[PDB]
Amino acid sequence: SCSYVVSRPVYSELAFQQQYERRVLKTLLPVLDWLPKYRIKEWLLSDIISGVSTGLVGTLQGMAYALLAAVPVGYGLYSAFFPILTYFIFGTSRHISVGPFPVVSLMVGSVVLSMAPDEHFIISIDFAARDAARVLIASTLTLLVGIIQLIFGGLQIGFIVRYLADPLVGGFTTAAAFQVLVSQLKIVLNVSTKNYNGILSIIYTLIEIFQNIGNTNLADFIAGLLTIIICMAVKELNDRFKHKIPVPIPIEVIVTIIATAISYAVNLEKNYNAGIVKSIPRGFLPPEIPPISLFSEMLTASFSIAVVAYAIAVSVGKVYAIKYDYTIDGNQEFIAFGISNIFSGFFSCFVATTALSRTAVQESTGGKTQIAGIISAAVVMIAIVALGKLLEPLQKSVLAAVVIANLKGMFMQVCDVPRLWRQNKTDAVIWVFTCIASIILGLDLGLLAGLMFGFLTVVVRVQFPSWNSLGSIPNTDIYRSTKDYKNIEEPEGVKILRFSSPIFYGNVDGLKKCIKSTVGFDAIRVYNKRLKALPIHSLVLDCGAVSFLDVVGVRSLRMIVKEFQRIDVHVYFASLQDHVIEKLEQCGFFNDSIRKDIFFLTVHDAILHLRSQ
Amino acid sequence: SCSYVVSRPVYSELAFQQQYERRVLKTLLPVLDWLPKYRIKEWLLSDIISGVSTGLVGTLQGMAYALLAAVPVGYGLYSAFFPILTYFIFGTSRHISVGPFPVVSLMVGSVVLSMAPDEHFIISIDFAARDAARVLIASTLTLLVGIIQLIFGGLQIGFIVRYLADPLVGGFTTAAAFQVLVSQLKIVLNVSTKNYNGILSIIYTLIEIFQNIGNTNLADFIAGLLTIIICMAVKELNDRFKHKIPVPIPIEVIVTIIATAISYAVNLEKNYNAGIVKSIPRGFLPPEIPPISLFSEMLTASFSIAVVAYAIAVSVGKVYAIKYDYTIDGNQEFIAFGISNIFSGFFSCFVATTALSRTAVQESTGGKTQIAGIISAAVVMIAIVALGKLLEPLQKSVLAAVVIANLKGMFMQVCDVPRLWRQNKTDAVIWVFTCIASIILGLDLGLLAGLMFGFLTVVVRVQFPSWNSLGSIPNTDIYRSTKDYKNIEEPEGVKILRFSSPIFYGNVDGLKKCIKSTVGFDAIRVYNKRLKALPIHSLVLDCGAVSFLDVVGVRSLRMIVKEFQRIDVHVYFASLQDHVIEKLEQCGFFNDSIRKDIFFLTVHDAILHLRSQ
Ligand SMILES: CCCCCCCCCCC(CCCCCCCCCC)(CO[C@@H]1O[C@H](CO)[C@@H](O[C@H]2O[C@H](CO)[C@@H](O)[C@H](O)[C@H]2O)[C@H](O)[C@H]1O)CO[C@@H]1O[C@H](CO)[C@@H](O[C@H]2O[C@H](CO)[C@@H](O)[C@H](O)[C@H]2O)[C@H](O)[C@H]1O
Ligand SMILES: CCCCCCCCCCC(CCCCCCCCCC)(CO[C@@H]1O[C@H](CO)[C@@H](O[C@H]2O[C@H](CO)[C@@H](O)[C@H](O)[C@H]2O)[C@H](O)[C@H]1O)CO[C@@H]1O[C@H](CO)[C@@H](O[C@H]2O[C@H](CO)[C@@H](O)[C@H](O)[C@H]2O)[C@H](O)[C@H]1O
Ligand SMILES: CC(C)CCC[C@@H](C)[C@H]1CC[C@H]2[C@@H]3CC=C4C[C@@H](O)CC[C@]4(C)[C@H]3CC[C@]12C
Ligand SMILES: CC(C)CCC[C@@H](C)[C@H]1CC[C@H]2[C@@H]3CC=C4C[C@@H](O)CC[C@]4(C)[C@H]3CC[C@]12C
Ligand SMILES: CC(C)CCC[C@@H](C)[C@H]1CC[C@H]2[C@@H]3CC=C4C[C@@H](O)CC[C@]4(C)[C@H]3CC[C@]12C
Ligand SMILES: CC(C)CCC[C@@H](C)[C@H]1CC[C@H]2[C@@H]3CC=C4C[C@@H](O)CC[C@]4(C)[C@H]3CC[C@]12C
Ligand SMILES: CC(C)CCC[C@@H](C)[C@H]1CC[C@H]2[C@@H]3CC=C4C[C@@H](O)CC[C@]4(C)[C@H]3CC[C@]12C
Ligand SMILES: CC(C)CCC[C@@H](C)[C@H]1CC[C@H]2[C@@H]3CC=C4C[C@@H](O)CC[C@]4(C)[C@H]3CC[C@]12C
Ligand SMILES: CC(C)CCC[C@@H](C)[C@H]1CC[C@H]2[C@@H]3CC=C4C[C@@H](O)CC[C@]4(C)[C@H]3CC[C@]12C
Ligand SMILES: O=C(O)c1cccnc1Nc1cccc(C(F)(F)F)c1
Ligand SMILES: O=C(O)c1cccnc1Nc1cccc(C(F)(F)F)c1
Ligand SMILES: O=C(O)c1cccnc1Nc1cccc(C(F)(F)F)c1
Ligand SMILES: O=C(O)c1cccnc1Nc1cccc(C(F)(F)F)c1
Ligand SMILES: [Cl-]
Numbered sequence A, B: 001s002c003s004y005v006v007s008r009p010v011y012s013e014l015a016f017q018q019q020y021e022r023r024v025l026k027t028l029l030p031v032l033d034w035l036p037k038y039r040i041k042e043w044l045l046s047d048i049i050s051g052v053s054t055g056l057v058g059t060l061q062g063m064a065y066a067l068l069a070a071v072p073v074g075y076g077l078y079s080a081f082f083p084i085l086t087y088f089i090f091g092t093s094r095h096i097s098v099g100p101f102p103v104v105s106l107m108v109g110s111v112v113l114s115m116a117p118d119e120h121f122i123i124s125i126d127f128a129a130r131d132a133a134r135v136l137i138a139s140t141l142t143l144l145v146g147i148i149q150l151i152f153g154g155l156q157i158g159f160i161v162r163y164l165a166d167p168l169v170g171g172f173t174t175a176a177a178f179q180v181l182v183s184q185l186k187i188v189l190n191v192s193t194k195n196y197n198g199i200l201s202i203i204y205t206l207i208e209i210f211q212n213i214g215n216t217n218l219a220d221f222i223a224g225l226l227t228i229i230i231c232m233a234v235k236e237l238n239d240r241f242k243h244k245i246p247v248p249i250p251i252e253v254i255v256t257i258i259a260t261a262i263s264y265a266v267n268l269e270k271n272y273n274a275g276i277v278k279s280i281p282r283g284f285l286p287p288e289i290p291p292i293s294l295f296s297e298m299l300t301a302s303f304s305i306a307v308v309a310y311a312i313a314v315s316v317g318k319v320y321a322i323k324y325d326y327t328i329d330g331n332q333e334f335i336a337f338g339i340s341n342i343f344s345g346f347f348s349c350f351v352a353t354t355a356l357s358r359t360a361v362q363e364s365t366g367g368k369t370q371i372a373g374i375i376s377a378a379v380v381m382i383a384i385v386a387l388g389k390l391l392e393p394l395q396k397s398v399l400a401a402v403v404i405a406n407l408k409g410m411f412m413q414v415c416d417v418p419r420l421w422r423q424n425k426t427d428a429v430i431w432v433f434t435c436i437a438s439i440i441l442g443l444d445l446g447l448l449a450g451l452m453f454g455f456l457t458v459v460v461r462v463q464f465p466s467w468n469s470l471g472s473i474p475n476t477d478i479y480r481s482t483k484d485y486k487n488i489e490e491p492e493g494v495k496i497l498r499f500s501s502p503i504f505y506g507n508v509d510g511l512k513k514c515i516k517s518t519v520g521f522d523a524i525r526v527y528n529k530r531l532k533a534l535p536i537h538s539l540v541l542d543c544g545a546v547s548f549l550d551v552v553g554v555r556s557l558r559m560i561v562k563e564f565q566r567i568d569v570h571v572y573f574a575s576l577q578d579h580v581i582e583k584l585e586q587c588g589f590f591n592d593s594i595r596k597d598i599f600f601l602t603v604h605d606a607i608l609h610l611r612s613q
């Protein structure tokens, strides 16, 4: 077939250079972009239906997620209502819904509980003062998170989500699922367990729950178990029988309605001392400015909460945008969510994000422009104003049971771990380290530890690269490692070394060790021995994989060249990229008889040049 | 001259693979290694002289460095005595001296002061109890540092000193010089300033010193100024006139003797209320076991102290070993220094290390085997037993003045900073960040921040690499960027892209963006538009600089290949290293009609193969 034929002179860097010469409306993204461009002819009915459905789902989700945070049920409605209204303007996406997403709710609740516990705040008990303190701390944390998100949006740094590797995301998700399960089990069992702050908190909580297992309430446990079993069974039959009924079956809403109807009918509150919500405020509360003096004690938590919320939001937005063939702006997502968090924090709400489940519920029922979000907000406010009394007899164990029932997918990555280990050990190590760190630590501390561990793994992978001693395949210009192909012939009196990495301090130490091992000796000892008394004549370095360079690398290269020229051994460089060559130039490498004449394009011109002498 | 001529068939990876087939006495290092091999015939006199000289220097240095730590003068003699005795056995080096090196002393003193201040420990004042508490905390910290060093020596991890980059070392040195200067100025001025713990401590200390400047003592200030001026002048004339007198002139010892003689003669203590040492214990104290319960509050400081001490010791040892043509074992250095720190901590001493200045004093006076260390220890114990009373009238301001006078070299890196910025911006950024962090923080926190910032800089340099669009030089097989050489011709209907970095998640996002920019479009939009309705026909990737790979990179490559094959665009790979090829193989890349037939050795076989069709 085709053959490889070429004829040209041998080109060093100097000769090659001699012969060839070198040398205002998007930042505040309005509704004005699509509102005039609307398609009211057919989109309105779909928007209305989708908004009604997603509002019905989001009301229950906000009521349920208010328990993950140490906030009374009723503020979740505000957290579902205000962020949608303030995101309708600055939002870039077109199919997402805004709400708690209980993981962020659990982070906020952990912060609030650790910053205001029962024994420290109250030495008597005053439920109202404790609730007010918890609400104030939640609002302050929300405001701080919003400020941080807005600041990050202003700086145009939205690529930090790249640093959230998939294995660490999976490990963090599994650990968060464990934390949520433990907290909701504590809620279901109706056992009073004092909070633990610090490391190994979950173990102490589980130990004390098992100790106090003797005080559990029978009715709440039975209701939770029945709800979990029913929801899991209906979800399993929905998953197995999937060709029909594209809309998900609203088993949770039916379960909640039946549970509250029975609770009101037979009055579990006074006959069995059951745990009901017992209180839902009516109307809208006036705004209150949070105290900013607490900002000094909520930095390392607000940073992680903002990062996690933004990452979830952009992930869901991209997943839907690639399906519907459009794009979203990451920095505008930062700006919109920061403004939304500020506005909600001024109105006694906790952090709001995308909730992929509710997003799918909204989209599968005729997903269209953000008018459905406005309709959902209208449904939520109608529920707030009037339907507050009808949900009074509902038990909190039912909501906790639903939250637990929706945790299986977060529990199903332990099956992905073994294949990940089989494919690449580093990814499995990152997964396990992130999971363990998030287990015995706070969630935010675990996230930060996982990020820095990923950075460390990248640095270590760069620091210990591959290296080889190369020889030529006969009658060709192909050089491969001598110990692998069994037909590689070593040239006479010259060594070829490949060091497949950029060169920095760790790499300069590694490269010195590799050179000493490959050449069979070192220049310093032989020079000293020869001075006291009073096999290789050339060395070629293949630098095709050298990405970048620093001052320490240049110093090490200069020292190596000088030491090898002391004992009459020539060192040549080949396949060096240009930008590395100017990096060498501006670091003062080309001084004291270097002259750039020892640089070649590939490792076959150097061999021919050596053979010419 | 010589020409480049080669003739061979075009080799893909599959054809190339088909045609060529692949496939107990050192851990406890004794004195027994050199003691029988001694050269007592001529080495003994040199050892005696060098030991006497270095003991005379080390006595004064230990007495002076005891003020940097919040420990009374007298324990520095123990810290100079015990570590030499316990290092004579396990030591690998042959020319170093063991002692405080005031930077580590200042770190220890900062820890001790922050863990036991005047107001908290004493509500009255009891000097003896405060001194006992400071000594106990110093001993406990020394024991913890020794345990950490021994543990690190057992694990055979001695290459962590590679992570201490030169710019961060220079910045840390400058910041430590500033801290030492401020503390010793506070000591010289004889002004009482309450300690500050936390961030911005040095600024508050300086502000309060300037506020209390009205209470300074005249005699101590005059003595310190005179000592500093005299020492600086003598050192300057010694440096300028250097051809003669190879041994350094002991101006410091003469200054100390004259100062103490005058102080005893005219009795500054009672006539001017001067600050003298006023107390030196006689004899040896019995050992006391430190309380281990404090270990929980000294981890992040002991880690940094151990790392810094080990780094200084190995640096000086290597500098002298390369001169005297021998080698030292890093892990054995860990073991020896950990055992030494444990032994000294059991005997009320602080951390001991190499003190390059005293090492040079020892070596320049006939450097030989470690017998000189034993002689120096003998001189130190003779000074302890008998000469304790003669140093009573000496002022502490003189010692502080000497410590300040020896700080110029640590202050002389601000001149190195500008050239570092001119050569490589990243190194200057690391230097400035380390200096600023060590200024407004603790020294250990600054060191940790500098290490993690170096890791971040390496990760960022890897994450944003170089990329280019390549074309061929006519009548050759050399491909260079089209926009640089002005004679590069772009081939017909094919694009060549070089992405000079390994591929991971940040790199996969960058590579997707680069491919989209280079090819002028993307596959998803054109595929969707063509489906709704119902310039480039080949792409070559130059992967010569791809070092390693992960699962995310493999997934991204698979997705890119599939998306480009959807719209009838062929993607080829060239210059991929072997180990990357097996990494692709074991990640499941070669599924669904890949067949390894799209891999070529270099980017000229791919072009010829394309031209054959
Ligand atoms: C973008 C890149 C990442 C940025 C990350 C930024 C992190 C910022 C941390 C800020 C920080 C360190 C500052 C130095 C950091 C040095 C790092 C060195 C790194 C290298 C080695 C501030 O440190 C000081 O803390 C003081 C309180 O201790 C605080 O209050 C003082 O002054 C007040 C008047 O101003 C006065 O009213 C008050 O009385 C004073 O005390 C000071 O204002 C503040 O300066 C530590 O604070 C963080 O917040 C909490 C504090 O309690 C603490 O909460 C945890 O508690 C749970 C257990 O209970 C735990 O389980 C949770 O997790 C978490 O809820 C966190 O743990 C801690 O971290
Ligand atoms: C190889 C790689 C590096 C390894 C680095 C290892 C560092 C280990 C730090 C250990 C640590 C964090 C543990 C969790 C870390 C989470 C990291 C998350 C990372 C991701 C984001 C322990 O944290 C807890 O601290 C408690 C005390 O607060 C301590 O005592 C509790 O139980 C006791 C009975 O056991 C009981 O008697 C006691 O009453 C209890 O309180 C607990 O035992 C201990 O668990 C923090 O402690 C460190 O030490 C000091 C504590 O005060 C503190 O001192 C600083 O003070 C100066 C200002 O004053 C400051 O200027 C100085 O610098 C420094 O002197 C340090 O700042 C702090 O860091
Ligand atoms: C289908 C789902 C939604 C129905 C949920 C309704 C809940 C409130 C009902 C269903 C089954 C009920 C339980 C059935 C049996 C008993 C035993 C009796 O000695 C005490 C009441 C108790 C423990 C009931 C409490 C209330 C209960 C848990
Ligand atoms: C080792 C290989 C062959 C296992 C292949 C099957 C995998 C997917 C399954 C089989 C049994 C599973 C384990 C069963 C029990 C536990 C204990 C609990 O902590 C959950 C994780 C863990 C540890 C599971 C991890 C995933 C697992 C190992
Ligand atoms: C990749 C890098 C950033 C990871 C760093 C993790 C470090 C900082 C963490 C991981 C686990 C942590 C330890 C977990 C448990 C305890 C016990 C407690 O009584 C004192 C703190 C101590 C001893 C912690 C010190 C800090 C620690 C060692
Ligand atoms: C050469 C070096 C080592 C000599 C050091 C000796 C010291 C103790 C001597 C040298 C100069 C002396 C000072 C000279 C002048 C005065 C002014 C007088 O009104 C009070 C005493 C005072 C302030 C002296 C104090 C002691 C002093 C500082
Ligand atoms: C105790 C106080 C005074 C400490 C102050 C430390 C800071 C402010 C100092 C110490 C060393 C200084 C640097 C030394 C050298 C240069 C190079 C030149 O281009 C001026 C700026 C720059 C980069 C300086 C910036 C300020 C700097 C970082
Ligand atoms: C900057 C270019 C043009 C010349 C560089 C010359 C170098 C060797 C010298 C000349 C003068 C020096 C500066 C003079 C004074 C100070 C104040 C103090 O904070 C130390 C840093 C700094 C800022 C010095 C840094 C180093 C410096 C800039
Ligand atoms: C590369 C990595 C390790 C750098 C990390 C630097 C971070 C952790 C450090 C650098 C400077 C620090 C800040 C310095 C000063 C203050 C003011 C104080 O009242 C609260 C803490 C706060 C706000 C610190 C928070 C932590 C901080 C932002
Ligand atoms: O997912 C949760 O945590 C959750 C909590 C309370 C109610 N509903 C929840 N989820 C959920 C998910 C899909 C469909 C539905 C619904 F439509 F049936 F309401 C609810
Ligand atoms: O998106 C979802 O549906 C989802 C569900 C459970 C956990 N995590 C989820 N998402 C998700 C995506 C990216 C990053 C993160 C994380 F950062 F919080 F870990 C979460
Ligand atoms: O360097 C110090 O901090 C120091 C402190 C006290 C005494 N002498 C010191 N140094 C020092 C340095 C070189 C030579 C001599 C001496 F030989 F003159 F004693 C002393
Ligand atoms: O070796 C010396 O003489 C010296 C003098 C001043 C500062 N630092 C010195 N050494 C030195 C060498 C390596 C690492 C370190 C550091 F880690 F402490 F910063 C110090
Ligand atoms: Cl969900």
Ligand SMILES: [Cl-]
Pocket: B355, B356, B357, B358
């Ligand atoms: Cl010194």
